[PDB]
Design a protein around this ligand. Structure first.
Ligand SMILES: [Mg+2]
Ligand SMILES: [Mg+2]
Ligand SMILES: [Mg+2]
Ligand SMILES: [Mg+2]
Ligand SMILES: [Mg+2]
Ligand SMILES: [Mg+2]
Ligand SMILES: [Mg+2]
Ligand SMILES: [Mg+2]
Ligand SMILES: [Mg+2]
Ligand SMILES: [Mg+2]
Ligand SMILES: [Mg+2]
Ligand SMILES: [Mg+2]
Ligand SMILES: [Mg+2]
Ligand SMILES: [Mg+2]
Ligand SMILES: [Mg+2]
Ligand SMILES: [Mg+2]
Ligand SMILES: [Mg+2]
Ligand SMILES: [Mg+2]
Ligand SMILES: [Mg+2]
Ligand SMILES: [Mg+2]
Ligand SMILES: [Mg+2]
Ligand SMILES: [Mg+2]
Ligand SMILES: [Mg+2]
Ligand SMILES: [Mg+2]
Ligand SMILES: [Mg+2]
Ligand SMILES: [Mg+2]
Ligand SMILES: [Mg+2]
Lengths: 402, 131, 225
RNA sequence: GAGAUUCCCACUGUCCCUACCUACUAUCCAGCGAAACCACAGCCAAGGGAACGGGCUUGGCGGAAUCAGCGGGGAAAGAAG
RNA sequence: GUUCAUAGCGACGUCGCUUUUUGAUCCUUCGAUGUCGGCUCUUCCUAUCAUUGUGAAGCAGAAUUCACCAAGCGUUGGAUUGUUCACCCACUAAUAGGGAACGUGAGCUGGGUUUAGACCGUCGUGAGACAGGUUAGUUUUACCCUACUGAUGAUGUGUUGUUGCCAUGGUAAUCCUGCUCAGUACGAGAGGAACCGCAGGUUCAGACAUUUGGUGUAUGUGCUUGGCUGAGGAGCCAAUGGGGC
C-alpha cells in the first residue's frame, strides 16, 4: 500500500557512489568550450585552502533592501603561487573520444616537480627525465621535437599544458608538487602551440588566468568524515527512543518485493572525501603577495581603499592549521570544499555570466584579521599593544634591554 | 521595493508569546504561521515580522476562544541582520492585527524589531522604539 | 492641494515621507510613481532627498523636523547622516539625538513654532529639540494616547487630530499650537492621521484610499488651495 | 492506593531537529576458542508451473580471494500449529 | 440547460474496464509463510489535486468548469479515536487516488484483536458462553548465502610511475510571494489581469565553520562541598564530586 503521507526523498541520487574519491587533487572533467575568436588564455589554476575570514563591503544592488548598505560576508582565502609550465599535451578528436596524441616536456624540470614521479623520493636515484632532457640539445633530438610540434599543429584539436605548483613557497610539509593539465583556449591550434611553447619553463601567475570580481568554479575533495551511519550520512529521521535494536537506523530498507535492497535506500558507509564541483564562486580579491623592494611589503594583502592599515591577509597569530600566507591569493566569496591546506582546482565558468549577481563590481571596505585561534578582538599587533600598554614581560625585557 | 531576508525563526507552533498591545490580551498562543507550505513532521515556525494565527490564553474574556491574526514583533532567538549583527530580544512578543495588517490595538509596549517595522507600516507607527 | 499617493501599494505615506516647508525626506525603497508625485507637486525650491534611517524605509516615523532642523534617531548610520546633511540646505541642521524612544516621529510632532512631545522624553532631548528646531517644546498628549506624533498631524495653518479626541482636549490643544485643530480621519477611517498624510503649508499628500469627503476636510483645515 | 481515566501549573531533547562528549564494546592484534543451522546451492525480469522460482523456458548477463556493516530475500531458524 | 439534445449534464436502455471494496470458491500453505494499525524508508502506477504546454465554455476581466500531452516535482501542521476510515481546526500552489505478501514486527512499537487473573450486563439449573463493554498481561536468534552500502584487491598492457580519455551506470532541482506593468487591458459598474524586468522566500540538494549557537575530560583556568596528606603552600579521592567561563 502507498505510504500514508508524502515526503521528499532523503539525499540525492546524483552522487550515488558515495565513496572515497580515487584522487586527492580534484580533476576538472570539463573545460570551457573553446572558441578561436577569443585571445589565447588558460582556463584553470591550482590553489591551496588557507582559511576563512569575513569582509565588510557596500552593495550596489538596486531594488534591494541592502542597496547602498554595508554587509558582512564570509570569504575563503586560497593561496595561489604561480604555476610553472613544464609540458604540452596534444589531443586529437576520434569517434571514440579525445585521445592523447603527443606529449612534449620542457628541459629543466623543477626538482619539486620531479618528486611527483616517485613514490619514495628519499631512496630514488632522481633519474626521471634525465635521458629525455638530453634530446633538447643534440640536433637529432631537436629535429624530433620539431616534428612533434609540427604533428601537434596539423593533427591535434585541443592542446593542454602541464603545469605544477611550487611547494617551496608554501608553509606546508609536502614538497611534492601538484601536476595538472590546463587546457589552452582561444585561438587556432597553431597559435595556442606557439603561445604554450613560449611559456615552457616559465611561471604563470594567477592574475594572468583569473580576474577581479568574476565568478569561477571550485573543484576539490571534501573533508573526510570516516565511516558514518544513515542519520549522519543521509540525514534520515531518528527513530523514537523506545526502539529496541537501535534508533540511528532506517526502519524499512525495502518492501518484500522486489526481494532485494534497492540502490536508492540509505545505508551506512563512507562519508566525506568526495569529489565535488561548486560553480559560481565570485572572486572578491586577488591578493598581491609579499614583495621586497627596500623593505617587506604586506599592506597589499589586507589594506583597502578605506582602511589604509599596513596589515596582511594573515590573521593575528597566523592561519589556524595552515601557516602563513606569503604568496598571491584569491579571496573567494563563501565556503569551499576541503580541509585547510587542501589543494583546490579553480576553473573558468562554463556558463555565460549575465545576471546581476555576476558582473557586479566588488569594492571592499574592511578585511577582518582578528585571531581565528579563539575569540580574537584585535586586528593588528600594533593595535593590541596600543590598547593594553606595556606588560610585565615587556618591562623585564626592557630592564634587560636598558 | 525589497523583501524580507531569511531570519532564524525560533517560534514554532504552540509557543506562547507576550501580547504587546493594549487590547487587553496578555499572551498569544501561536497555532499556525502564514505562508508555510510545510514538510513531514516539521513544525511551522515564525520569526519577527511573520503573520501568525494565534489565540489568547489569558486576557479579556471576549478575546479568548477565538482565532486572531497576529504579527511577531520581538523574539528571544538571535538572528543575523545582513551586517553581521546577531540581535535578540528579552522576550517574545506580538501584536494582534487583522488580515489587512493594521492593529486591533493602538499602542505597543517595548521595542519593535526593525525587520517587523519595515514590513508592517501600521505596526511601525504605534512602535515606541524600533530596535 | 491634496494629492493622493501610495508608496509601493501602501497608503501609509506618512510612514515613507517627511515634509517640512523647506525639505522633503522620502524613503528609498520606492520607484518613480511615488518619488514623482513629490518632486512634481512640490514647490520647486524645496529639495527632495531619498533617505533611509537605520536602513529602514519608515523614515517618516523615525524622524522629526521643521524648517530649522532635523532630528534623526541613534540607530542612524553615519553614511546616512552625512547624506542627509549633504542634501539638505545648510540652514537645516541635523542632530542625531540619543533618546530611548527612537521613534522620534511617533513620539514628538513639531511645526515651525511648537512641538507636542511624549511625556517620557528625556529632558536632554527636550532641550536638543528647542535648540535645533527653535521650537517651544510642550510635554502634552491627548487623553490616553502618548504617541502624539502619529495620532495628530499639524502645520502652521491648522491641524488634524484623532477622531476620538474630546472637544475639551481639542480645545486645550488648539491653545498650545494656536492653530485650529479639527478631528478627522484619513485613508477612509484611520485614526493614525500621521501615518496617512504629510502636510506642508502649501501641499498635502494623502494615501490612495482617502475618501473625497476626507480629502476635503484636509484642504479646509490646512487652509490650502 | 507501584489500581483505571481527564484537565491545569511547573518542568523538560518526547518532539521541531538533531549535534557533541565520556565509559565499555564492536574494530585490529597475541593467546584461546564454541553453537544454531546445512538436499544441492545461492545475480535478475517475464513465462508457464501445486495459481509468488535459486535451479526449468525465453531474455538480461556472468571475473579470483576477501573486510566492516546491513537487515530486502532465503515464503531464514526455533516447536510433528 | 431563460431558447438550444450533446458548453456542461444524461432518463429509459445497453457495452465495457479495474482488482485500492465486499462476496463466491477452496488450488498452495496446519512436522507454522508471525495475525491490525501507527512509525520509518524506498520505489512504482495514473483513473492529474497543484505546477509546465495546450484545446473548449452558457470563457468580458477575475474566478470556475470540461478535455488533451503529461507522473518531472510536490501533496503539510494539529484536537478526538488503537483505529484503517471519519470529522473538525489552520496553513497551502495543492493539501489527488492507489500498488509493492491488505510493502515494511531477526526494523520498532504493542494502543487493538486473540491465551491464562478480574469486574459488569445479557444468556445458561450449572460448569460456562457472548464479531458486548472494561482493566492487567515475557515481542526471542544473524557470525551463513545473496541483495545493498562502503573497503582492499584481482585479469591483461615486460616491471613501475605520472598525466589523461570515456564505454557504461547514476543524475536534480522545485514551488511561491512582493514591486513594476497597473487601478492598466476588460467591464455599465463592482471589480480586475498577463508578458518582459527586479527583489526575495519554500521544499530539496551539495558543502562549509569567518561569524552566532551547541558540545567540551585540552580534565585548560578560576570558584566551591565532604574527606585526606601535621599546617601553610602544593595537591589528591568522591566510578567526570559539583559548578562558571
Ligand atoms: Mg500519493
Ligand atoms: Mg523495547
Ligand atoms: Mg576559531
Ligand atoms: Mg508525524
Ligand atoms: Mg524471478
Ligand atoms: Mg500437526
Ligand atoms: Mg501438536
Ligand atoms: Mg429544452
Ligand atoms: Mg485445498
Ligand atoms: Mg518461521
Ligand atoms: Mg518470514
Ligand atoms: Mg492520462
Ligand atoms: Mg501487510
Ligand atoms: Mg521482515
Ligand atoms: Mg519481532
Ligand atoms: Mg495490550
Ligand atoms: Mg483474558
Ligand atoms: Mg441467572
Ligand atoms: Mg501490571
Ligand atoms: Mg566481527
Ligand atoms: Mg549518461
Ligand atoms: Mg529523480
Ligand atoms: Mg575541600
Ligand atoms: Mg591550602
Ligand atoms: Mg584513597
Ligand atoms: Mg564507593
Ligand atoms: Mg559553556
Amino acid at each position: 500500500s502507498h505510504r500514508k503521507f508524502s515526503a521528499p526523498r532523503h539525499g540525492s541520487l546524483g552522487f550515488l557512489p558515495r565513496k572515497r574519491s580515487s584522487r586527492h587533487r580534484g580533476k576538472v572533467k570539463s573545460f570551457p568550450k573553446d572558441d578561436p575568436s577569443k585571445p589565447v588564455h588558460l582556463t584553470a589554476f591550482l590553489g591551496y585552502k588557507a582559511g576563512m575570514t569575513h569582509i565588510v563591503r557596500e552593495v550596489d544592488r538596486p531594488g534591494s533592501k541592502v542597496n547602498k548598505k554595508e554587509v558582512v560576508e564570509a570569504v575563503t582565502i586560497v593561496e595561489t603561487p604561480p604555476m610553472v609550465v613544464v609540458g604540452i599535451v596534444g589531443y586529437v578528436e576520434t569517434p571514440r573520444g579525445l585521445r592523447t596524441f603527443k606529449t612534449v616536456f620542457a628541459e629543466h624540470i623543477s626538482d619539486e616537480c620531479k618528486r611527483r614521479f616517485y613514490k619514495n623520493w628519499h631512496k630514488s636515484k632522481k633519474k626521471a627525465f634525465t635521458k629525455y632532457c638530453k634530446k633538447w640539445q643534440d640536433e637529432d633530438g631537436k629535429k624530433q621535437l620539431e616534428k612533434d610540434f609540427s604533428s601537434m599543429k596539423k593533427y591535434c584539436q585541443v592542446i593542454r599544458v602541464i603545469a605544477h605548483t611550487q611547494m617551496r613557497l608554501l608553509p606546508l610539509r609536502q614538497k611534492k608538487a601538484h601536476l595538472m593539465e590546463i587546457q589552452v583556449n582561444g585561438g587556432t591550434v597553431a597559435e595556442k602551440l606557439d603561445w604554450a611553447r613560449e611559456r615552457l619553463e616559465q611561471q604563470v601567475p594567477v592574475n594572468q588566468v583569473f580576474g577581479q570580481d568574476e565568478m569561477i568554479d571550485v573543484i576539490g575533495v571534501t573533508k573526510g568524515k570516516g565511516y558514518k551511519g544513515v542519520t549522519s550520512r543521509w540525514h534520515t529521521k531518528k527513530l523514537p527512543r523506545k526502539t529496541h535494536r537501535g534508533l540511528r537506523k532506517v526502519a524499512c530498507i525495502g518492501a518484500w518485493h522486489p526481494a532485494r535492497v534497492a540502490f536508492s535506500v540509505a545505508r551506512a558507509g563512507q562519508k566525506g572525501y568526495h569529489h565535488r564541483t561548486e560553480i559560481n564562486k565570485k572572486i572578491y580579491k586577488i591578493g598581491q603577495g609579499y614583495l621586497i623592494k627596500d623593505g617587506k611589503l604586506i599592506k597589499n594583502n589586507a589594506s583597502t581603499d578605506y582602511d589604509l592599515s599596513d596589515k596582511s591577509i594573515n590573521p593575528l597569530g597566523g592561519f589556524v592549521h595552515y601557516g602563513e600566507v606569503t604568496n598571491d591569493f584569491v579571496m573567494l566569496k563563501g565556503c569551499v570544499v576541503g580541509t585547510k591546506k587542501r589543494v583546490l582546482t579553480l576553473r573558468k565558468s562554463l556558463l555565460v555570466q549575465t545576471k546581476r549577481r555576476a558582473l557586479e563590481k566588488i569594492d571592499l571596505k574592511f578585511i577582518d584579521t582578528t585571531s581565528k585561534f579563539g575569540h580574537g578582538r584585535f586586528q593588528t599587533m600594533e593595535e593590541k599593544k596600543a590598547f593594553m600598554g606595556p606588560l610585565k614581560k615587556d618591562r623585564i625585557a626592557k630592564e634587560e634591554g636598558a | 521595493s525589497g523583501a524580507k531576508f531569511r531570519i532564524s525563526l525560533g517560534l514554532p507552533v504552540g509557543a506562547v508569546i507576550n501580547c504587546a498591545d493594549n487590547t487587553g490580551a496578555k499572551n498569544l498562543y501561536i497555532i499556525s504561521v502564514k505562508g508555510i507550505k510545510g514538510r513531514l513532521n516539521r513544525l511551522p515556525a515564525a520569526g519577527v515580522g511573520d503573520m501568525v494565527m494565534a489565540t489568547v490564553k489569558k486576557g479579556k474574556p471576549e478575546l479568548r476562544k477565538k482565532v486572531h491574526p497576529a504579527v511577531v514583533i520581538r523574539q528571544r532567538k538571535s538572528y543575523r541582520r545582513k551586517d553581521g549583527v546577531f540581535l535578540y530580544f528579552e522576550d517574545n512578543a506580538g501584536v494582534i492585527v487583522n488580515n489587512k495588517g493594521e492593529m486591533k490595538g493602538s499602542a505597543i509596549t517595548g521595542p519593535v524589531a526593525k525587520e517587523c517595522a519595515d514590513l508592517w507600516p501600521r505596526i511601525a507607527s504605534n512602535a515606541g522604539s524600533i530596535a | 492641494m491634496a494629492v493622493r499617493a501610495s508608496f509601493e501599494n501602501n497608503c501609509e505615506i506618512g510612514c515613507f515621507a517627511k515634509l517640512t516647508n523647506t525639505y522633503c525626506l522620502v524613503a528609498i525603497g520606492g520607484s518613480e510613481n511615488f518619488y514623482s508625485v513629490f518632486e512634481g507637486e512640490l514647490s520647486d525650491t524645496i529639495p527632495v532627498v531619498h533617505a533611509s534611517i537605520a536602513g529602514c524605509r519608515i523614515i517618516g516615523r523615525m524622524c522629526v523636523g521643521n524648517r530649522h532642523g532635523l532630528l534623526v534617531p541613534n540607530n542612524t548610520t553615519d553614511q546616512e547622516l552625512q547624506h542627509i546633511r549633504n542634501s539638505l540646505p545648510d540652514t537645516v541642521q541635523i542632530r542625531r539625538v540619543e533618546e530611548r524612544l527612537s521613534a522620534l516621529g511617533n513620539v514628538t510632532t513639531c511645526n515651525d513654532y511648537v512641538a507636542l512631545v511624549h511625556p517620557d522624553l528625556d529632558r536632554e532631548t527636550e532641550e536638543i529639540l528647542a535648540d535645533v528646531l527653535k521650537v517651544e517644546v510642550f510635554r502634552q498628549t491627548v487623553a490616553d494616547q502618548v504617541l502624539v506624533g502619529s495620532y495628530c498631524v499639524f502645520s502652521n495653518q491648522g491641524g488634524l487630530v484623532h477622531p476620538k479626541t474630546s472637544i475639551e482636549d481639542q480645545d486645550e490643544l488648539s491653545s498650545l499650537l494656536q492653530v485650529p485643530l479639527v478631528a478627522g480621519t484619513v485613508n477612509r477611517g484611520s485614526e493614525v492621521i500621521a501615518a496617512g498624510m504629510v502636510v506642508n503649508d502649501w501641499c498635502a499628500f494623502c494615501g490612495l484610499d482617502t475618501t473625497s469627503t476626507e480629502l476635503s476636510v484636509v484642504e479646509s483645515v490646512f487652509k490650502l488651495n
